[PDB]
Amino acid sequence: LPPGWEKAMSRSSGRVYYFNHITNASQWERPSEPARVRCSHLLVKHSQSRRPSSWRQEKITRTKEEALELINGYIQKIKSGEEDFESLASQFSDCSSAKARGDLGAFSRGQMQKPFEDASFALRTGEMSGPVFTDSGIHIILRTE
Numbered sequence: 001l002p003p004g005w006e007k008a009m010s011r012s013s014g015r016v017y018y019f020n021h022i023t024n025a026s027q028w029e030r031p032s033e034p035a036r037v038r039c040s041h042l043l044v045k046h047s048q049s050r051r052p053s054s055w056r057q058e059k060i061t062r063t064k065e066e067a068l069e070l071i072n073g074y075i076q077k078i079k080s081g082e083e084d085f086e087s088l089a090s091q092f093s094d095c096s097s098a099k100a101r102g103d104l105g106a107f108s109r110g111q112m113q114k115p116f117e118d119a120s121f122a123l124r125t126g127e128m129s130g131p132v133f134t135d136s137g138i139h140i141i142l143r144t145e
């Protein structure tokens with residue numbers, strides 16, 4: 001299977017699914033490197049972020065666990081189609097790139113924080129990550145190119 005995938009078993013349904021330990025994505029279907037990729041992201045900061053502040057809040061006080069719960073809720077609505085990634089990023093991302101619907105532009109290896117970079121380059125074009133942890137906080141990453 002493609003870089004970083006493994007089989008797993010649903011605890012609730014017993015049905016097999018697939019999980020990527022680089023991007024933290026999970027899916028039911030069996031899944032099937034460039035100089036640069038283009039990604040958007042939605043960042044949720046927490047009280048141990050490297051800079052716990054953003055355009056949304058002068059003092060970000062939420063815990064890491066609380067930030068993960070927010071991230072998980074956003075992923076759920078994106079995957080159900082109730083909301084779009086671009087819409088949630090514009091409204092709730094703690095990165096100034098919120099004003100660009102989360103778009104970071106194109107980048108090479110070496111420029112971003114390593115867990116972010118590895119998830120970005122392991123996604124297929126159009127793919128979304130699960131929660132990705134860095135010193136900035138927790139991200140949802142969408143590879144657009």
Ligand SMILES: OCc1ccc2ncccc2c1
Nearest residue numbers: 095096097099100103104105
């Ligand atoms: O934080 C890096 C970054 C990248 C892209 C951006 N685009 C628009 C506004 C702010 C932006 C910030």
